[PDB]
Enzyme design. Sequence first.
Site, PDB file in Angstrom:
ATOM      1  N   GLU A 148       0.838  -1.194   0.000  1.00 59.09           N
ATOM      2  CA  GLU A 148       0.000   0.000   0.000  1.00 59.09           C
ATOM      3  C   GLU A 148       0.875   1.248   0.000  1.00 59.09           C
ATOM      4  O   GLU A 148       1.814   1.342   0.799  1.00 59.09           O
ATOM      5  CB  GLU A 148      -0.944   0.018   1.201  1.00 59.09           C
ATOM      6  CG  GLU A 148      -2.082   1.025   1.054  1.00 59.09           C
ATOM      7  CD  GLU A 148      -3.077   0.981   2.196  1.00 59.09           C
ATOM      8  OE1 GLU A 148      -2.752   0.403   3.252  1.00 59.09           O
ATOM      9  OE2 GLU A 148      -4.191   1.525   2.033  1.00 59.09           O
ATOM     10  N   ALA A 283       1.316  -0.941  11.103  1.00 56.78           N
ATOM     11  CA  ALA A 283       0.811  -2.238  10.673  1.00 56.78           C
ATOM     12  C   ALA A 283       0.228  -2.078   9.276  1.00 56.78           C
ATOM     13  O   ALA A 283       0.091  -0.964   8.764  1.00 56.78           O
ATOM     14  CB  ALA A 283      -0.238  -2.787  11.644  1.00 56.78           C
ATOM     15  N   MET A 284      -0.115  -3.210   8.663  1.00 55.57           N
ATOM     16  CA  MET A 284      -0.716  -3.226   7.335  1.00 55.57           C
ATOM     17  C   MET A 284      -1.751  -4.338   7.274  1.00 55.57           C
ATOM     18  O   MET A 284      -1.455  -5.484   7.623  1.00 55.57           O
ATOM     19  CB  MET A 284       0.345  -3.419   6.245  1.00 55.57           C
ATOM     20  CG  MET A 284      -0.232  -3.518   4.845  1.00 55.57           C
ATOM     21  SD  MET A 284      -1.245  -2.087   4.428  1.00 55.57           S
ATOM     22  CE  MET A 284      -2.278  -2.779   3.137  1.00 55.57           C
ATOM     23  N   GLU A 285      -2.951  -4.002   6.805  1.00 60.60           N
ATOM     24  CA  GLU A 285      -4.125  -4.870   6.917  1.00 60.60           C
ATOM     25  C   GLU A 285      -4.247  -5.879   5.780  1.00 60.60           C
ATOM     26  O   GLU A 285      -5.362  -6.151   5.319  1.00 60.60           O
ATOM     27  CB  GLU A 285      -5.382  -4.010   7.003  1.00 60.60           C
ATOM     28  CG  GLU A 285      -5.711  -3.213   5.737  1.00 60.60           C
ATOM     29  CD  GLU A 285      -5.041  -1.858   5.695  1.00 60.60           C
ATOM     30  OE1 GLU A 285      -4.148  -1.608   6.530  1.00 60.60           O
ATOM     31  OE2 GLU A 285      -5.411  -1.042   4.825  1.00 60.60           O
ATOM     32  N   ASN A 286      -3.144  -6.465   5.319  1.00 63.80           N
ATOM     33  CA  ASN A 286      -3.217  -7.478   4.271  1.00 63.80           C
ATOM     34  C   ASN A 286      -4.197  -8.576   4.662  1.00 63.80           C
ATOM     35  O   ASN A 286      -4.076  -9.179   5.734  1.00 63.80           O
ATOM     36  CB  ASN A 286      -1.832  -8.069   4.009  1.00 63.80           C
ATOM     37  CG  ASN A 286      -0.767  -7.007   3.827  1.00 63.80           C
ATOM     38  OD1 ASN A 286      -0.751  -6.288   2.827  1.00 63.80           O
ATOM     39  ND2 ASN A 286       0.140  -6.910   4.792  1.00 63.80           N
ATOM     40  N   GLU A 319      -6.480  -2.709  12.649  1.00 68.25           N
ATOM     41  CA  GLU A 319      -6.265  -3.549  11.477  1.00 68.25           C
ATOM     42  C   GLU A 319      -7.378  -4.569  11.287  1.00 68.25           C
ATOM     43  O   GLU A 319      -7.709  -4.912  10.147  1.00 68.25           O
ATOM     44  CB  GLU A 319      -4.918  -4.260  11.585  1.00 68.25           C
ATOM     45  CG  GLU A 319      -3.744  -3.323  11.799  1.00 68.25           C
ATOM     46  CD  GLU A 319      -3.578  -2.320  10.674  1.00 68.25           C
ATOM     47  OE1 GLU A 319      -3.836  -2.680   9.506  1.00 68.25           O
ATOM     48  OE2 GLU A 319      -3.189  -1.167  10.957  1.00 68.25           O
ATOM     49  N   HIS A 322     -10.178  -3.027   9.539  1.00 70.56           N
ATOM     50  CA  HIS A 322      -9.901  -2.853   8.121  1.00 70.56           C
ATOM     51  C   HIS A 322     -10.365  -4.033   7.278  1.00 70.56           C
ATOM     52  O   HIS A 322     -10.602  -3.861   6.077  1.00 70.56           O
ATOM     53  CB  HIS A 322      -8.406  -2.633   7.908  1.00 70.56           C
ATOM     54  CG  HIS A 322      -8.014  -1.195   7.765  1.00 70.56           C
ATOM     55  ND1 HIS A 322      -8.577  -0.360   6.824  1.00 70.56           N
ATOM     56  CD2 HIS A 322      -7.099  -0.449   8.428  1.00 70.56           C
ATOM     57  CE1 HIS A 322      -8.037   0.841   6.922  1.00 70.56           C
ATOM     58  NE2 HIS A 322      -7.137   0.814   7.888  1.00 70.56           N
TER      59      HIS A 322
END
Length: 883
Positions: A148, A283-286, A319, A322
Amino acid sequence: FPVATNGERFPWQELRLPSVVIPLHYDLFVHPNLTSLDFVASEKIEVLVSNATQFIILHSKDLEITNATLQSEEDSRYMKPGKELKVLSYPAHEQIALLVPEKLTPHLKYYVAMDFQAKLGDGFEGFYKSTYRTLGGETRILAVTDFEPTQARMAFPCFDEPLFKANFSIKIRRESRHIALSNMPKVKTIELEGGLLEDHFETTVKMSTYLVAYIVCDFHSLSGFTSSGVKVSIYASPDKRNQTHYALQASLKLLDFYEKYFDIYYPLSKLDLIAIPDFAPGAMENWGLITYRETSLLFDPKTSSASDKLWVTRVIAHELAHQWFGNLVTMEWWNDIWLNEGFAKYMELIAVNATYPELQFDDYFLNVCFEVITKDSLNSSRPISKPAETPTQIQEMFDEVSYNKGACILNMLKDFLGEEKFQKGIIQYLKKFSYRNAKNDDLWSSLSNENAEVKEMMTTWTLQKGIPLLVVKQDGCSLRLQQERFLQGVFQEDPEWRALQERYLWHIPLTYSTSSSNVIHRHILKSKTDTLDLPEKTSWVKFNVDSNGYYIVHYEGHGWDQLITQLNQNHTLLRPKDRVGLIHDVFQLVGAGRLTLDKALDMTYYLQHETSSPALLEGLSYLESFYHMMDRRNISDISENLKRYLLQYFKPVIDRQSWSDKGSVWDRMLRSALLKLACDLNHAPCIQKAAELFSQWMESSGKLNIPTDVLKIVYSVGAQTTAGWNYLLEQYELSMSSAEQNKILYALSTSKHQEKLLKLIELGMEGKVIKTQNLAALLHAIARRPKGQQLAWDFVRENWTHLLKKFDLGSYDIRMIISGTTAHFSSKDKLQEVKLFFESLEAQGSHLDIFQTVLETITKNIKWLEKNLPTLRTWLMVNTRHH
Ligand SMILES: *[C@@H]1O[C@H](CO)[C@@H](O[C@@H]2O[C@H](CO)[C@@H](O[C@@H]3O[C@H](CO[C@H]4O[C@H](CO)[C@@H](O)[C@H](O)[C@@H]4O)[C@@H](O)[C@H](O[C@H]4O[C@H](CO)[C@@H](O)[C@H](O)[C@@H]4O)[C@@H]3O)[C@H](O)[C@H]2NC(C)=O)[C@H](O)[C@H]1NC(C)=O
Ligand SMILES: *[C@@H]1O[C@H](CO)[C@@H](O[C@@H]2O[C@H](CO)[C@@H](O[C@@H]3O[C@H](CO[C@H]4O[C@H](CO)[C@@H](O)[C@H](O)[C@@H]4O)[C@@H](O)[C@H](O[C@H]4O[C@H](CO)[C@@H](O)[C@H](O)[C@@H]4O)[C@@H]3O)[C@H](O)[C@H]2NC(C)=O)[C@H](O)[C@H]1NC(C)=O
Ligand SMILES: COc1ccc(C(=O)O)cc1S(=O)(=O)Nc1ccc(C(F)(F)F)cc1N1CCCCC1
Ligand SMILES: *[C@@H]1O[C@H](CO)[C@@H](O[C@@H]2O[C@H](CO)[C@@H](O)[C@H](O)[C@H]2NC(C)=O)[C@H](O)[C@H]1NC(C)=O
Ligand SMILES: *[C@@H]1O[C@H](CO)[C@@H](O[C@@H]2O[C@H](CO)[C@@H](O)[C@H](O)[C@H]2NC(C)=O)[C@H](O)[C@H]1NC(C)=O
Ligand SMILES: *[C@@H]1O[C@H](CO)[C@@H](O)[C@H](O)[C@H]1NC(C)=O
Ligand SMILES: *[C@@H]1O[C@H](CO)[C@@H](O)[C@H](O)[C@H]1NC(C)=O
Ligand SMILES: *[C@@H]1O[C@H](CO)[C@@H](O)[C@H](O)[C@H]1NC(C)=O
Ligand SMILES: *[C@@H]1O[C@H](CO)[C@@H](O)[C@H](O)[C@H]1NC(C)=O
Ligand SMILES: N[C@@H](CCCC[NH3+])C(=O)O
Ligand SMILES: N[C@@H](CCCC[NH3+])C(=O)O
Ligand SMILES: [Zn+2]
């Protein structure tokens, strides 16, 4: 008009991809090697051709493409063997062109096959490498993705725009010493001839390219099952498995709440949360594989405080929210990025308060709105919905306006429509656009189902920058309500004020209470001026109940005098959050020129009777910031008076603080703030106790149970000697707790030896002992102190080109490195050097909206001193005589 790298013309001109070719399914095979630090990969993209075309346009960056074919089972011209495609590269738009031998037939499906390879990234974007340290002192390598907004094109050619949703079938080849994680569960593992292994993952649901994820590592996990049978696993480096316990417990509770609250199940069988040692955002909401910073996921009861406990709970809730607001429902284009980040930020309040009410996150949410008001009260702000094109501009959309202001205007809309009506609206919104995309108007229509009321209201809150100021005048029972655009550092009698107030109008859902009746009364302010009638001649009226509305209230006449009198006589007659909002708005209006500073400082007198920690910490933050503002400017006569006033007027609450971890969350946060304030003012009892704890800790040569609430304070005092400073740096490299390392690095930043501060900056640049992901926060911690102020500003100017090789221009690290070393300046000399530095960067072709934001912030600090410095000096001097 665009020319390709081979000299030929590029058949596409726009930054946005064409809509004629639509991806349906991605077959993605990646073969990374964690020894040669590179990878080879291949893909087969099932696409649907809606318009006849001679070329296909795709995103690709820093990828060497070796083969390109086109097959089709519906178009016999491209049967099983296929036809070779000629690729054309256009890096300016990060696009490639696939030229076909014969134009494609509309409404028929094709298969785009490509082979590609590249090295593992050395930054924080795309498919990059990361390292960690074991308890025995070993360094291990992992490979992790972060896409992202526009970095999926750096790992595999794709239609890298969030509207081109598709399925993803991912296969990963690896050694036996590694596992492979992806979005979906692993369906099978096949052993290969040479001894390698190949993991096959389930096909994803429809989703955007920026959510694709795959990781190759050797991490361990703790697993659990939600009420709906979702297998949640928390992954971390093997020696940190004990720190994943709370993350699992919180994930189970939060996922269950989100499923019931949204009335939509999490659609995947598993959900993984992994703590990445080198990670740029929190963080990243993969989808199905949420990546985290170690400080955002891991918790150690021995070295992590209650505020760390609150922080980890916030990010996990952020997250997991998300998965619905972001993964299930995605925005059409990054102009409406707040549909993801604003709702996820908002759902933190709902989820954490419902799952962990003991954390008291409801009181802490006011800080989210007060923080963005600081930037929103400046002219260099932006509307929350703003067009964006280039990758840098898209990265700039990830700011406090999208996150904080989005959550705060959603909380304001919730209070206007009610929880039940608001919850029913977002449920219809999530179900209507599941696996699809939506824009702002889609959300307003969903919340409408009075209709034209909420769409026309929220339009003014999303397309207009800034925050409104409500001016109230009271005579008898009549209330004259006027709205203006709140500007900081700009007075009403200034010539710029008239030019900044035109064509600004908000539909403000006003809420107020009086001294005669605690019942909440509401009124929608649509025009520039309006009148309201009160039933009884009350002593005061308090607008914006609990500060649920995103606006500031100013009172004319004796309005403030009545409210301040109420605080000194019976402060419990005002709601606890009303007191927080009053303390906040009073000091904001001083900067706006509607109130003199002595009127603000007079309100702080009641804080001697304030037992609500949110209001107490709010009022202390202004007095503490005033002290540090004088200290940085070497105004020693005012800083000494402020030091004595704080240590004397708040001595009762300071002395009765224990050096432990007892009490509630706000009790522990009050303890940490008070003891940090006292020790920062060199209060002898605070220094004696902290130095004693550090001495015993170092004399023990190990870790003795030092309370986590005072851990950052004890380490800071110990770093004032070269002996303790060297021991903390040694303890930093050997620590298995990222939270402890965070506190240790802060302590090292409080040193008064410039050679020690420069060493930390050098280590942060080197990235081996102090990881580069902490460089931006380290430079900020050094710059906010007088001894390191000049050093950090000199370093950023002299090493700008080196910093731009570690991070992207639009990255959040560069934004904090710029802001964290310049924003606190308050002299015309520094304003000139900052203005010249930004101009030199503009000449190099680097433009960031943070440039004007920093300049306006520095000018505000200059004009704040020019208007209020003598008043602060006089008020403090009057106080030394009032005792
Ligand atoms: C990422 O990249 C790294 C580096 O390229 C790879 O690691 C190497 O992988 C290769 C291939 O698996 C390894 O080489 C093989 O080692 C085997 C073990 O050797 C022992 O046994 C032989 C006798 O059988 C002894 O002579 C030797 O001294 C050892 O005691 C060998 O059996 C293999 O030989 C056979 O295979 C090759 C294939 O090329 C043939 O050409 C040979 O003639 C023979 O038939 C082979 O030599 C190598 O050891 C690995 N290096 C390290 C440091 O571990 C990773 O596999 C790769 N990972 C991924 C996921 O791609
Ligand atoms: C790409 O990703 C999309 C998802 O975005 C996939 O679309 C799904 O496809 C599967 C399989 O075709 C569908 O699964 C079926 O769902 C039925 C119920 O779905 C309803 O309820 C959900 C709830 O959210 C809605 O989203 C949905 O729109 C429907 O309203 C079940 O009843 C099915 O189970 C029964 O039928 C099968 C087949 O007869 C039996 O074998 C089962 O044992 C069982 O008796 C089934 O589970 C799913 O609904 C689709 N989702 C959407 C949103 O359309 C694509 O399949 C995927 N593409 C590829 C190539 O993988
Ligand atoms: C995806 O990330 C987040 C998820 C949820 C929330 C939420 O609202 O709870 C917030 C963030 S965040 O990205 O805004 N996090 C952050 C912000 C500011 C700073 C700063 F240093 F400037 F103060 C640091 C961080 N983190 C935390 C520890 C240091 C590493 C990055
Ligand atoms: C935080 O959670 C509490 C607990 O659920 C919420 O308080 C409830 O609010 C509903 C609706 O207003 C009432 O029906 C309940 O009786 C309340 N319970 C308690 C114990 O007070 C509170 O509203 C939540 N806060 C926010 C901002 O949503
Ligand atoms: C306050 O911000 C507004 C909006 O950005 C500025 O208005 C624009 O300013 C730019 C550059 O100064 C001009 O090119 C535009 O033509 C302006 N547009 C309009 C509609 O005025 C405004 O100049 C800013 N004011 C100050 C004092 O900085
Ligand atoms: C695609 O075909 C439709 C068919 O009517 C046409 O309306 C549309 O303009 C075409 N678009 C492009 C980009 O060729
Ligand atoms: C992890 O917790 C278990 C629980 O008893 C304990 O035995 C073990 O020593 C702990 N390990 C670490 C590294 O904290
Ligand atoms: C504050 O209000 C409460 C509620 O009536 C009252 O009991 C208390 O005495 C008041 N405080 C003072 C100092 O009058
Ligand atoms: C602060 O001002 C005093 C008095 O002028 C001066 O002696 C001292 O060197 C100054 N220190 C700094 C850091 O500016
Ligand atoms: N979407 C992420 C941020 C991604 C940032 C990537 N550089 C979040 O939850 O905040
Ligand atoms: N608790 C986080 C810091 C959060 C910063 C919030 N602005 C950490 O461990 O570093
Ligand atoms: Zn987010």
